[PDB]
Every structure is written in C-alpha cells, then in structure tokens.
Amino acid sequence: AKCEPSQFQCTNGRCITLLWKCDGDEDCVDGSDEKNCVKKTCAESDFVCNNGQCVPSRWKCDGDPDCEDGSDESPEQCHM
Amino acid sequence: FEHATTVPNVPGIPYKALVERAGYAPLNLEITVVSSELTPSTNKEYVTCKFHTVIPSPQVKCCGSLECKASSKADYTCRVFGGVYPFMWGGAQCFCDSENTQLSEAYVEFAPDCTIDHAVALKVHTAALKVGLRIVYGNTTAHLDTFVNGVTPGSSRDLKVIAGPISAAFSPFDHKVVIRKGLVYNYDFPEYGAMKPGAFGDIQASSLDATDIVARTDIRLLKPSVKNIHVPYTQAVSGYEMWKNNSGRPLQETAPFGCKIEVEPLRASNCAYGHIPISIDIPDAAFVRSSESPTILEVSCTVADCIYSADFGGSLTLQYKADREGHCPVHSHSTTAVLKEATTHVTATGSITLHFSTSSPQANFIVSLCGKKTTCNAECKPPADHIIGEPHKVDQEFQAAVSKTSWNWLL
Amino acid sequence: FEHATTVPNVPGIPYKALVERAGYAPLNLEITVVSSELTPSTNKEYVTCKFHTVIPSPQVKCCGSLECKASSKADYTCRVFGGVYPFMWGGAQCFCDSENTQLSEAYVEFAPDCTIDHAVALKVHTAALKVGLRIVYGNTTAHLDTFVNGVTPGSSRDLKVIAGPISAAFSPFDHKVVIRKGLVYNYDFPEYGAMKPGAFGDIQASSLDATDIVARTDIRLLKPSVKNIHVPYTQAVSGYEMWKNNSGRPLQETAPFGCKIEVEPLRASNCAYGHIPISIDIPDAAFVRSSESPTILEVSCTVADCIYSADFGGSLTLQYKADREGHCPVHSHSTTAVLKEATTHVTATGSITLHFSTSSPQANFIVSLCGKKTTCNAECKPPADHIIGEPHKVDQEFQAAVSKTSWNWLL
Amino acid sequence: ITDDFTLTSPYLGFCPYCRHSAPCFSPIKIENVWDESDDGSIRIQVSAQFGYNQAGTADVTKFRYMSYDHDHDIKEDSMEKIAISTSGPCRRLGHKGYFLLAQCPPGDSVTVSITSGASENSCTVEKKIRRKFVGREEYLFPPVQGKLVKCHVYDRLKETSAGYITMHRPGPHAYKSYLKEASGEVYIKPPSGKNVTYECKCGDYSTGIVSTQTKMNGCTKARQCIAYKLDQTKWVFNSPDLIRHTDHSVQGKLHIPFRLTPTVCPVPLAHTPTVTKWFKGITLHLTATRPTLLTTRKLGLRADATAEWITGTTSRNFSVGREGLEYVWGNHEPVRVWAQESAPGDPHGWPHEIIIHYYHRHPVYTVIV
Amino acid sequence: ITDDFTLTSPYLGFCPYCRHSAPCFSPIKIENVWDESDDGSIRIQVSAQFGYNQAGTADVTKFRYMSYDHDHDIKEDSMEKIAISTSGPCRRLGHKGYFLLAQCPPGDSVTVSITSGASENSCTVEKKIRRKFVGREEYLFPPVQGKLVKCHVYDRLKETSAGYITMHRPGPHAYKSYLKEASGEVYIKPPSGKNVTYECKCGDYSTGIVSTQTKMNGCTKARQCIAYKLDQTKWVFNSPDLIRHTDHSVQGKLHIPFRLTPTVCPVPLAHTPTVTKWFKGITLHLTATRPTLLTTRKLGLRADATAEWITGTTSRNFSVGREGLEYVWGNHEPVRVWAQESAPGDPHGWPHEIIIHYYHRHPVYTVIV
Ligand SMILES: [Ca+2]
Ligand SMILES: [Ca+2]
C-alpha cells in the first residue's frame, strides 16, 4: 500500500493514517501498527500477570482461567 | 345651516372663522385637531427567526446497505456513505469491514428563544385615515372623531360634520414593511417561496407554531473520515442575524412630516400634511338674532408695537363705542393675521385690547367687531429670537411677504 | 519511416496525426504529454536561521591589567572596562576598591531548534526541460520519457523519438532563490561574506552543523552601572525573522503558465507553453500492406447541430458501402477541428458516428475514412454555458474564426 | 410532556476539546449555548442531569452522569463540584435536567468542568460572546437611577418553560472488553449476572442471547464480531454522538427551563446638551464618555435623517428651516425646534439695504426679481 | 556528551522580577524561552534542576533548590509546588534537568513560581507569545475532522535531545558573613568544619587557607577583604550572572530535551463557494466565519496573482479568459476554470447580429475592420 509517504502501510493494501499507529486499537486487518512501539502500561483498572498480559479486573475469580497460567483464579488472591 | 371651509391639517394649531346670515349676529367658529392617525390595511404572509439545525443520531447498518427516502420537514438533506467503521467509547461497534454503510441527515426548525425575537414581514397598501378634532360653536365645545373620506359622517349632540379628501394623499410606508420587537423597518424582503441562503427570509412559516415550515440553507453533508462516529456538515450564515447586524435605522426616526409610528395596529399618528376640507352643519339653538345683539359703531384701532413671529407677539388696541352692552365676537379677516381672543364683552364707551400674530412685515389687516369693519396698519420689525419651540400659526403668502415700501419702490 | 511533427506543449490532451506512405495502409498516430517538468541546475552556497546570542560568564580581575584576545567565533565582540564593583548574593566580590576591571564577551551561534526552519540560499541557471510522452499507433501503446534538447533521443524498447528544441524559452526561477520548509520564494540574498544587520543573510554557514559560522549583527556592549553584576548589551533585531514577517507570497502562487513548483529537486513540473517539435521513427513491423485494409465507396458525411466549445460537442455521422470486414483509421485533415476516436469497425453497409471539437463557426473540414476523402459543411451555434473545466483542444487560428456568411457579406 | 427523570438517563458525548487539549469522550459534553438574554445570562445544555440522584428523586445537591467503566451504571457526585468558565469564572444561577444557567463576562469559549478528584474533566466548545446593552448610551454597569425600558431576560426559576426537547430509545452500545481471543477461537464472556447478545458474521449470520461464557463456532479472530447487553430502556436525547435504535421514534418530551420573559430595566441618561442659537441653525454642544446615539430629522416632505454614535466631547451644526426639526440625543425624549426670520437689516430702511434682508430669506428668488 | 546528573548543580540567578515586583536574586532564574512549535508548546530553561534527588539519583518528584543561607547546600522540595503561568495557569507536560515543557495561552510574559511552602518566588520575563495556526483557515480549537497537513510539534518525551549545551567549573563565591568588625582589627571565621580560602590586600597581597577564627597582618576596615569556600566542585551552567573561573573550559556536555518532531495534524475546511457564471468571468459567493485566504492567478504569460484574508459573507468578481484561471479557497484543492467564447448574438442569420456577437469577442478587431 503506502498510497502517500505521510501515512502507514498494511499488507491488505490499505493505507491508514500515521495517527492510528500504536494507539491500542487494531485498525487494519494485518494488525501491524502495534507491533513496533513500547507499550504504555496496563490500565488503572487492569491486572498485570507475570507474562505482562493485561487482565481486566472484572475477569478475576469468575471461575474461568483467562490469563496465560490462571493466576487470576489462584486462591492466593480470590480464594474459592 | 351648512358651512364649508378648508382647515389646514396641523395638529395643535387652531384657526378662526365666522359665519354670517340675515338678521343673526355672527358667532365664533374654531376647528382644531387634537389627534390624527393614519392606519393602513396590512397582510401578514410569513414570520422568520434564526434557525436551529437538529441532527438526529446517525444510523449504521453492519454488513449491509440502506437508502433514504425524502420527507417533508424543512431543508431535509439526506446522504449515505459506504465503507465506514464507527467507533465510540466501547470500541468495535460494527462486525464488518468496508461493507457497512451509515446514513446522515440534518433538517432545520425554529430556535427555542425566537418566540420573542422574531420578525413579521407585512405587505401594506391603501392607507386610510381618521382624525379627531375639537369643534367650538357659540361657546359650546364639542368633541368629534370622524373619518376623512367625503362620505362617512359623524354626529355628537346635533353636530353633523363631513370631511373631504386630502389635497395630497400619501403614506410613510413603502409596499413591503417588516416589524421586529415593536419597531418598524422598511425592507424589500423575498416573497413567500423564494428563499436565499445568507439573506433575510431564510425561514418561511405562516405561523410561529406551525407544523409545516419551509426553508433552504444549503446544508451539505461531508463524508466522515475520523475514527469515531460523527456527522460533519457545513452551513451558510443565518440570514436573520446578518440582516440584524445590517438593519439600518428604524422607520421611527426616519419617516417624514414628523409622523410618529405606533406598532400594534401599525399606525402613523400626529403628523401634518396638506389641507382637509370640512362641511359643518350648525343648529339654530346657538344663533341670536339682531333684535338681541349689541350694535357697534365707530370702530377705531391702533397698534402699539408689532412684530411678526410664531408666538402671539403683536399687540392691538380696539377703541369703540356701542349702544347696548353684552358679548360681541371679534375676528381678523386677513389670512396672515389671527387673533388670540375669540369673544369680548362690549359696553357703552369701553376700550378693549387684543393680541395677534402675523407673518408679513406689514400688519395691514381688517378686523370686524360684530360686522363693523375697519382698516388697521403699521410696520412690524423682525424678531431677534430666531429659534423657538412653537409652530407658526399662519402660512407665508406672496404679495404680502414683501414690504409695502418695497412695493412702492419697485412699482 | 520518419515523420516530422509539431506537438503543442499542453499536458493532458492528445493531438492526433495520420502517417501515410506509398502503397501502404494509413496508420493512426497520437501523442499525449502526461508530465512535463523543467529542473534548473542548483548550487547551494550557504544556509541561515535565527541566531541565538550566548553571553559567557564575565571574567573579573581584581585590580589587575586585563585585555582579551581575538577568537574565531561568530561576531565576537570584546570590551574591557574600569572601576566596577560586582555584587553577587554574597556582597563585595573583591577586596580591591575602584581599581578592578572586568571584560565583557558576547558571540552568537545557531538556535537549538533552527534545524527544522532553516532557510537555504540557492543559485539557479540553465533549466532544461524533461517531458514524458505517451504515443500510440496501430493498437500498440508505448510509455517513454525524453529530453527536449535537440540532440539526445530518449528511446524506448522499439521507438526512437528525437524531441527537438522547444520554441519558447523561459524560467520562472530568477538567478537567486531561497528555500524554507518546502516553500519556494524569490529573493536576492547577499553574497557569502557580505552581510547586513537587519536583513536576510544576517548569519551564514556552509553546513548546518559547521563550526565556521560567520555573522555580523553589530552587537555592542555597554558600561555596567548597576549595583549587582550583569553585562548589558543592545543587539539588532534578527534579519531572518523580520524577513519572515514580510516575506510575501511564495512562487507556488505567482509562477506563470500554471507551473506547480515542487522543492526536492526544485522542479517546475507540469505546465504548458510553446511548442516541442519531434521526429518519430515508426518501425516497419507495425505497418501493413494496402491490400489488406478494406476499401470503401459512396462515403458521405452528415453534420448534426453542434456548439463549438472545448468539450466534444460537435457530432458527425457517415455512410458507406464497404466490401470486406475489418478496421480502418479515421482522421480530419483540418488544423482547427480535432476528431475524437481513431480506429473504427467498418461493416458492409452500416454507419459510423464520430465526434469532434471545432473552434470555428462553420465546420467545413475534410474527413478521411480509411483513405477516402469527403468534405461536409454546416453551420452551428455558439455554446450555451460560458464556463467549462476542460481546456480548449484547438486554437482560434484567426482564419476560420469568421463565418462564411460574414465572408461573402464583406467580399 | 413529562417531568419525571426516573424514566431517562444521561449519555456520553465526544467533546471537541477535553481537559488534556485533545478531543476525547467526556460525560459533560455541552450541546448548545443560547445567548439571547439581556443581562448576559446563558442557558448551557450538557449531557449530564443536575438536581437528581441515581433514581431521580429531585435532590437539589446531587447530579447524575454516565460512568466510564465497562459494566456501566449511573453514579453520583456532589453539586458543589461544578464550575463554569468562559474567560474568568462564571457564577451558577440555576439548574434543572440537562440544562443550567450562568452569567459571566464576554469571552470566546464556554467551558463546564467537574472539579472533583476522581471524575475530573472540562468540556469546551467555541462560542462568540460579547457584552450587550439595551437602548442607546452604551454602559458597563447599569446606573442606580435612570429611565425604565423594556428588557427581555431569562428568569432564574426552574419552573418555567420555553422549548421542546425530545428523548428517544437508547441505541445498542457494544464493548470490546467482552470478547476473548484465548488460543484460536473467540469467547464471549458476559459480566457478573448480566445478559448480553451477540450479532455477527462469523462465516454467516448468527445471533443469540447468553449469560455464561460460550465459544463461537467457526471463528478465528476477536475483531470478527461484537457483543452488547440488553438492560438499557431509559430514554436518551437524540444527540448526534449516539446510534439510533431500529425504530428511533419520539417517546417523550422534557421542558427547556429558564424561559425568556419581558421585564423592565434601567438605562442611563446622558448629559443634557447646551443649545446655542444662530440664524437658520443649531449648534449642539454634546458631551459624553461612552458611545451615545444622536439622531435628527426634518419635518417636511423630505426628512434627510442623520444617525451617528459620538464618544468624545464634540459639537455639531444642524440646519433648521421654517418647518423645523427634532433631535433625540441619548435616551432623552425628543424635542422639536422651529426657526423664524431674523435676517440682518430692517425691512423699512431709509437707504436701499432692503435687499440684504430679503437676500437671506428667499436667497435666489430676490436676485431674479 | 554526558548524562551523569550527580555531578552538576543549580545556581542562583539575577531575575528582573520577583514576588514583590523588583529585581531580586532567585533560584528560579530563567534564561531562555522557546516557542517555535506549531502547537502552542513552550520550552523553558530555569536555574533549578527538576526531576532529580539531592544527590541526583533521578527521583521523578523532587527538584534541587539551591538554598539562600550561608554555608549554602543543595536541598529539594516536591514538584507539586512548581506551577507556571502566562496569563492564566497553564499545564506542565514534562520536565528534565534545567528544562521543562508547557502548554500556555497567549499572553505577554512567562511566569514560573513556587506556589506554597516556606518560600514563594517568581520570575517573569518579557516575551510576546501569541496564538499561531497551521496552514490557512485560521481557527481557535483543533477541529475533529479536517485536512491532515504536516505539523512540527515538540516531542514531550524526555529522552530526546533537541540540541547541545555546555557546562563549566564553578567560580569563586565570596560571602559577607565571613568577616568580623569588632575593633580596629579584622577577624575572619569559617563555619564549623569548613575550610575557607581568604585573599585580600592591606599592605600587600596575601592569601591562605584557614580552619579557625584567624587573625590578619594588619588593616583597619574589613570591607577590603573577601573569603569564599573552596570545597565546591560541582559544575554550573554558563550563565551571565556568575563569576568566571581561571580556566573556564568546556568540562561537560548534557542534552537539551524535547526535540522538535515532524508529525501530522488536522486543519479545518471552509464552506465550498457556490459559483455564479457570466460572460468571461466568475463570481464566488464566499462565506467564512473566520479569516480565510483566497488566492487566484491566471494561466497565461502574465499571472498577476492576488491574495486576501476575507472574514465575512462577500462576493468577489473575477475575470477569466481563453487561457483560464485557477483559484484556491482555504485548504481546498486548487480548481481550474477555463472560459469559452459564447457572446450574445448569432454568427449567421442576419448582418445586424454578427457585429454584436463579434464585438464582445475582440472589442477592437471589429472596429478597425
Ligand atoms: Ca492502531
Ligand atoms: Ca479470571
């Protein structure tokens, strides 16, 4: 793509604005604008696993593992 | 008894006239106009204020398409766009990529604050007239208020009066008039149906609370390109505000002849132009015959110090001797000299004084005390005070506005 | 087979032509200019930006003889004083009263953030002109770009196009041109080494990061007379910023002939002026014998009502009685009526519709279908709307611009 | 036309200029700003209700607003945390429903803000505000004594009404946080004890209502399809920042408070001019410190009126004929002045200076004769 | 270059203003202010290092202070106290070392002050900063949707070097509190545990390093002696209000943060003008609520272009010929218009309507022929 040098290129052939790069929202189907940047942080109301994957605070101890291991369901935080 | 004369149409300034018959003592007759309004017949066609564009929340159909059909509300401009991916606070509002379409529309209606700040565009013509005038006959004051056409009568205690047409007929309003907030302008507004953006008459409506208004303000919906969902649009400036900033002075402080304008029926009251002819009928209850009138003979007058101005500045002394004693009217016949007094008591060998005002340098006017005429003349100097707040009671007439010495020199 | 031709230098619109040999079927030929950029030969000599006066700490010598050297910094300016008494927060910065001296020091340098708005001074001369042609012939399309100098041929895989010298010669760029932030101005900066305080070129530098910065901005030091310690100075206003205030319109909005000026090679791309005669050489493989293209008889041209305008308004129809199916070229042999299409499918006894764009009130031109020549004449009216967004295809020619009615009326 | 607020709810707008100087979603987006008053009052309309609690029981010291969190509910905040500013701080005169009223000096923007600790934003829109006076004699502060004219000013009581607002059905509001992308297949996880619906084109069209987590057949990407809840029935104004429902019909109306009312108001009177008298003329000696309108007109068939705003201490010359003229200086009543003949030279002079008197009067008609 | 921040120190500067509006010695002396950004940002250099500890171990919420009193040391406070302003309070967007970013409204001066605590200072320096916009279509707030042009905004990250700055070794700083005047003899005394380096003249030049209350050779008045402290070696910026050292060479080099960065930004598009046609001409029914620039130029051998900033709803008559015209309006694309030959009349039919038609075209060729 890259229909002009002031914007960003995706493999779908879509040229999207540079302002849409690394803003936390998947914009083009390839999903390339987020792969090259230093992530800000997890949200104030989000949980950080050991792997760094942000976990919403609502998804904690609801009975289903959601993180990479299951530390959200571990009894050390929300006991059964 | 019928009598006809032409009283000038100037409010507040009276005038004097007498009537004569056979075997009857002449009596005073003064007609003064207190108020005079000029009320035309108008026609309201539409009322306008500044718009208030209402954009309903846009519609999106995911993985599909839709069209829009026209409606009847004012300036309804619709448009559909293809290939949008709307977002709001909770992202991913649509499960489709470059297949969903959104719909945009933006109509126009009246503002919520223009139930007071609106303008009414009238259409006036054939301005009629009516006048209220005081009539005094034989020391019996009467009040009347009649029309001005030579047909419509008016009666109050056996007083029948007919007013003729104006010498010059006019109205201070043009063909098209516009009123906002109690004061009248003079504008050439667009007709009901020819709307131009950015000019007065942008919104038409027969009534302010009407259901079917019409307007056009060249709305143009642009294509959305920002991440979230919002309908963009550009619009022309409101014609009402643009005219309001360029309204000019109102007709209150522009109309000629000193006409002051009321706005509730759109009048034009208390202003002077032309002469109105009159035809007044008098009963016999106020007429005394010669067998009861005092007889006057050997009238003599001298003026002390004459001056010609608008106020009563001239002084007149009337020396006389009569047979009986009573009341006898006095009147000045010339059209350039009027007398302040109306009637004066008469005795055997009295001597009364009077007052008068003139517009000519020569005070050569003939008076008549109960019909005994006499000449009376002297020179009048110009006044030093040349600015006053009282209109002239008499008009300027040629063959008298030039001094008699000048007549002798040029003849 | 060479074919010398003159092509008007107007980008976007084609210009048709017909090439015919002896015993060969005629071949169509059109030449369209799609991009025409002229690039002057630039020569940077210095750059400049807003300066930043830096004043080092004032050296003090407490009743000692003191003089300064001469350095190689930009606009160095010394001055040694006498009889001072500096006061910092702890007062009495020396013990020696009224005999101690300090030297001031003040040199200028480049601003920290002038690496983004620095202005480059250029010298431009002898602008060539590079043209990208697009020629088609016999269903074969070629895309080649050539120089317009009279010698060097820019040749494609098969073609050989010697583009001759261009008739007119001009250059929108003056001898001196300045560049900043992608906008091309037109100024006359002072030469390297001769500055003027308060004008463009107040500070000079070969490279932006070069240390041999030479400047002249008359910064003058004053004698301190303050109880505390600080070195006063009075410096002239920056020349670059004051020029920036009243630079004027750039050359992107003033250049004649409609050139839009790009800044990276300092181009003047895509404008129209003059003529660029060429010399094409079609390979013989694209031709064909005259015994293969169809032959026709009974060809008559009928002209429907037209309006002479930039767009293809004029219509045309033909009649014929051919003998073999095939494709035949069509062309008009006039210099003021360009046709629309070149190739057509000729059936046995059908009819072909054409289009043209005439600039004359009467279209008495010759139409050649597959070689046979026929002429048709007609009268048609001027166009209705008098503003169009498409450039004219042919010229007034000042010869057929008058009608035959006027011709025979005057003659 | 209803008045209960237990059947409505606020919403989230998209303010063009948030607190951090960038457009962002905000719960106090202001829609319209009316400035047709005479004291300078303003009727700001925002997207948050004032004067009601979470159930809408008309508590004067509490205002509602939509939350930011994903299991979104309406929350509370004290009323004394609302501030309005245009160029300096405004002062609050009233509030009811979406609307509020204020009065503050002319500026170039209209900003409302929550000055709390947890919820803190400041929406801002562009609006041109200029100080407005009534009648002539431009003034800054109304005087203590002056003539009374007709003013039209908003009344401070909330129990008035001038307008017609319309609430509609609340549109769907999908959230990206419901979805899961665990390994290869998408999971839709409803919140704690709430019902959501999914509507999506994962291969083909499929729609269902779930309360527990489920995996979706034939899915590979979390962006393929969305989910939203169905516990929204309270009405929402048709702001252009929402999504209309499947029908989007008129389903109720609310009052626009703080109606425009006629009310008398004072207005200053200027210094009385000192008139001097000369032949066929008037020389007004005007004196003012602020723009005052002086207008004159004749009384004949033509009026040739005049209109000028004067500011300094000047003097003007007018010409008055036999029919007279009038002038309305400032807010004073009009006065009429007529002129009479005072041409120099006696009309009965022994020498022949009779002409120079009849030359001022009848200026041209004496030379021909 | 270097970034080891533990061996640098702030300094006291002479400031044109103060809390009491008079030139004072303040530790918040500001040297330069840069406002060369297309966003309204500002970079300020002060004489007090922000975002660092007492030793300088990069504490994000502390700043060195450079206390007033004798035996001067280096202390800190919290960064909650630092607040700057231009005309009203404005926002802090970053801080590192001497430098800190800002976003401030247009005004006429730059104020930086410590709000609360034991010491309140200020430093207002005269600089005319005013609103600037990008491209055409002068606006007040950045719109939501428009044309995306290339801006140049400051990079509010702190680890980006905009330039280069120099450091030197500190000069001698004498004090008045190190001198004694008790009799016809002079004493000098250091603080407890510090070694001062006295040098002065009375009879001849003498120096030395002492540790206790030390006598002199002989002289009456103690105003003719100085005594500074010797054991300070932390670097000080090249400020014009410091006494130079003996050598004063470039010891170290640290960064100037907040590098100017190219990026994109939205600018508004105006309302498209409706075009009215007339014979060899064009009119633009222009409408713009804010100043917008209109540029026109012909396409012949003479261009005679124009440029004006219109601000209302006007109409500008232009003349276009055979070669054509192009006009831009605000941020819109350049649109070209060519005029064709259509004069009133007919070039056929009757002779009397041929002269008229050939007179609008070529108004001099028909006369001579
Ligand atoms: Ca993204
Ligand atoms: Ca979990």
Swiss-Prot record, chain A:
Instruction: Tell me what happens on changing D66A.
Output: Complete loss of entry of Semliki virus into the cell
What is the recorded post-translational modification?
Glycosylated.
Which cysteines form disulfides?
C3-C15, C10-C28, C22-C37, C42-C54, C49-C67, C61-C78
Q: Which body tissues produce this protein? A: Abundant in heart and skeletal muscle; also ovary and kidney; not in liver.
Quote the disease note of the record.
Answer: Cerebellar ataxia, impaired intellectual development, and dysequilibrium syndrome 1: An autosomal recessive, congenital, non-progressive cerebellar ataxia associated with disturbed equilibrium, delayed ambulation, intellectual disability, cerebellar hypoplasia and mild cerebral gyral simplification. Additional features include short stature, strabismus, pes planus and, rarely, seizures.
Question: Subunit structure, briefly?
Answer: Homooligomer. Binds to the extracellular matrix protein Reelin/RELN. Interacts with LRP8. Interacts with LDLRAP1. Interacts with SNX17. Interacts with DAB1. Interacts with PCSK9. Interacts with PAFAH1B3 and PAFAH1B2, the catalytic complex of (PAF-AH (I)) heterotetrameric enzyme; these interactions may modulate the Reelin pathway. Interacts with STX5; this interaction mediates VLDLR translocation from the endoplasmic reticulum to the plasma membrane. Interacts with CLU.
Which purpose does this protein serve, as stated in its record? Multifunctional cell surface receptor that binds VLDL and transports it into cells by endocytosis and therefore plays an important role in energy metabolism. Also binds to a wide range of other molecules including Reelin/RELN or apolipoprotein E/APOE-containing ligands as well as clusterin/CLU. In the off-state of the pathway, forms homooligomers or heterooligomers with LRP8. Upon binding to ligands, homooligomers are rearranged to higher order receptor clusters that transmit the extracellular RELN signal to intracellular signaling processes by binding to DAB1.
The entry's protein name is Very low-density lipoprotein receptor
The residues of the intact protein that this chain contains are: 31 to 110 of 873
UniProtKB/Swiss-Prot annotation, chains D, E:
Q: Which residues form the signal peptide?
A: none
Description of post-translational modifications: Palmitoylated via thioester bonds. These palmitoylations may induce disruption of the C-terminus transmembrane. This would result in the reorientation of E2 C-terminus from lumenal to cytoplasmic side.
Residue ranges in the Extracellular topological domain are 1-367
**Compartments where located:** Virion membrane; Host cell membrane
Q: How does the protein associate with the membrane?
A: Single-pass type I membrane protein
Question: What is this protein identified as?
Answer: Spike glycoprotein E2
What does the function comment of this entry state? Plays an essential role in viral attachment to target host cell, by binding to the cell receptor PCDH10. Some specific strains may also bind host receptors VLDLR and LRP8/APOER2. Synthesized as a pE2 precursor which is processed by furin at the cell membrane just before virion budding, giving rise to E2-E1 heterodimer. The pE2-E1 heterodimer is stable, whereas E2-E1 is unstable and dissociate at low pH. pE2 is processed at the last step, presumably to avoid E1 fusion activation before its final export to cell surface.
User: Which cysteines are cross-linked by disulfides?
Assistant: C15-C123, C18-C24, C90-C104, C151-C265, C200-C225, C202-C219
Quaternary organization: Interacts with spike glycoprotein E1. Processing of the precursor of protein E3/E2 into E2 and E3 results in a heterodimer of the spike glycoproteins E2 and E1. Spike at virion surface are constituted of a trimer of E2-E1 heterodimers. Interacts with 6K protein. The E2-E1 heterodimer interacts with host PCDH10 (via domain Cadherin 1); this interaction mediates viral entry to the host cell.
Q: Where in the sequence does glycosylation occur per the annotation? A: N195, N317
